[PDB]
């Protein structure tokens, strides 16, 4: 994982942009804003809380690599995403139509771009009266 560790250290350097070895709330916020996304301080605080485990108010690189190396694909994630899909699955039949799914994706929560929603519907076979099983999606996300 030497190449992986090198890439992670390079990304950490890009984030902090200094030898401190730590990224504060403002340090993360500035780099996030540079992409043109208009964050909010509250979610920066929540984010640094959710990454940092020592409770010192900043992220140490050992924790950076610790919660990097962890891959997204997990059974916990499997069931969490399955239930998140279920909350929108009327009748709990395991099938979601390509109409309400687009609306919830574009509108609810962090609104998604219409092109992205088209990408979502075209990602899987919409055939079958427009009802697609979200289980195939959950498995695809699991694959990673």
């Amino acid at each position: 994982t030497e190449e992986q560790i090198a890439e992670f250290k390079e990304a950490f350097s890009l984030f902090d942009k200094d030898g401190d070895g730590t990224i504060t709330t403002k340090e993360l916020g500035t780099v996030m804003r540079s992409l043109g996304q208009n964050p909010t301080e509250a979610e920066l605080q929540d984010m640094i809380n959710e990454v940092d485990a020592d409770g010192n108010g900043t992220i140490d690189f050992p924790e950076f690599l610790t919660m990097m190396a962890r891959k997204m694909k997990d059974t916990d994630s499997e069931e969490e995403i399955r239930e998140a899909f279920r909350v929108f699955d009327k009748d709990g039949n395991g099938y979601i139509s390509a109409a309400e799914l687009r609306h919830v994706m574009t509108n609810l929560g962090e609104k998604l771009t219409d092109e992205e929603v088209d990408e979502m519907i075209r990602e899987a076979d919409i055939d079958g009266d427009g009802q697609v099983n979200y289980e195939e999606f959950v498995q695809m996300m699991t694959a990673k």
């Binding site: 890009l14 984030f15 899909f85 929108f88 919830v104 994706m105």
Partner: protein
């Protein structure tokens, strides 16, 4: 620097006024007292004995109320600028277009007209003021977020239309029949039961248990019939109160359940958003930064969602339970296939 604090205080005032929660309500409670401090005073103004003292106190309280309501109005319009949709002169105009804001301004100018009229003291201005004093209860009308109370009452009535209609029908029959029978057995001995309308008034005032006593049965047969029928009628007239109380409790519980479920909607959408962000994640440095941000956003969204998925009700928990059960069913069938 300055703008940060400015918008911070602006948002604080907006959410203490337009979206009260917790201690904010205290302020509202305070003005509510002042609201009563108006109405009651004006009611006392009707009494000719206290009309002088009541009128003086009502003028003082009207000045105080006008000051308070003008301050609230200008705070509210200034705080409307907090949101971008209502930031700038266009935003102030848009907020003034809201029915509750125009109702507030119309009651404000009614109050100022009241004060000017009292200063003038014209006789027609007196009628104007008595009219404009009832214009203050519309603050209470505006207090509720678009008829929450009316919606709850109507929903409960509709949900229990069967029991309510049963009670109304049977109680109305009891009223009609008992009034008629008491009229028959007292149309002559008792003068107050001279006509059937009098007996109907007696029956309404009896079965409701108001019991004014202006009309009461006198003949012993009338007393016996009245007691016997009142025993049923009082229960059937009290039924709607209990039915509506139970319906209110049930309805509010259901609304709380639905609100708790809707609390899941936003976090779940956020979770799916960040999940696909991370999936699509897989300069290269910038792309890796994007991967990191998307995956950590996924983590926080998952944290929120799993936090909100605590079982609020036995039904909800058993439904998640049955999802798990169907999952087990599929697994055990797959196993039996493998064996």
């Amino acid at each position: 620097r300055r703008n940060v604090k400015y918008r911070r205080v602006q948002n604080y005032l907006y959410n203490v006024l337009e979206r009260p929660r917790g201690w904010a309500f205290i302020y509202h409670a305070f003005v509510f007292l002042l609201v009563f401090g108006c109405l009651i005073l004006s009611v006392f103004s009707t009494i000719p004995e206290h009309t002088k003292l009541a009128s003086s106190c009502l003028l003082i309280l009207e000045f105080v109320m006008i000051v308070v309501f003008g301050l609230e109005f200008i705070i509210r319009i200034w705080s409307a600028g907090c949101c971008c949709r209502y930031r700038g002169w266009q935003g102030r105009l848009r907020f003034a277009r809201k029915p509750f804001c125009v109702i507030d301004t119309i009651v404000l100018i009614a109050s100022i007209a009241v004060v000017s009229a009292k200063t003038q003291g014209n006789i027609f201005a007196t009628s104007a003021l008595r009219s404009l004093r009832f214009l203050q209860i519309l603050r209470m009308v505006r207090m509720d977020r678009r008829g929450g109370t009316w919606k709850l009452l109507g929903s409960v009535v509709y949900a229990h239309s069967k029991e309510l209609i049963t009670a109304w029908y049977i109680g109305f029959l009891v009223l009609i029949f008992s009034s008629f029978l008491v009229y028959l057995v007292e149309k002559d001995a008792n003068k107050e039961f001279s006509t059937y309308a009098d007996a109907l008034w007696w029956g309404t005032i009896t079965l409701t248990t108001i019991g004014y006593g202006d009309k009461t049965p006198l003949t012993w047969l009338g007393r016996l019939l009245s007691a016997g029928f009142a025993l049923l009628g009082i229960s059937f007239f009290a039924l709607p109160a209990g039915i509506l109380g139970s319906g209110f409790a049930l309805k509010v519980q259901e609304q709380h359940r639905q609100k708790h479920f809707e609390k899941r909607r936003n976090p779940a959408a956020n979770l799916i958003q960040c999940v696909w962000r991370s999936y699509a994640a897989d300069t290269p440095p910038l792309k890796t930064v994007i991967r990191a941000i998307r995956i950590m956003k996924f983590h926080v969204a998952k944290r929120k969602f799993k936090e909100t998925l605590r079982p609020y009700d036995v039904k909800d928990v058993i439904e998640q339970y049955s999802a798990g059960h169907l999952d087990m069913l599929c697994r055990i069938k797959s196993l039996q296939t493998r064996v």
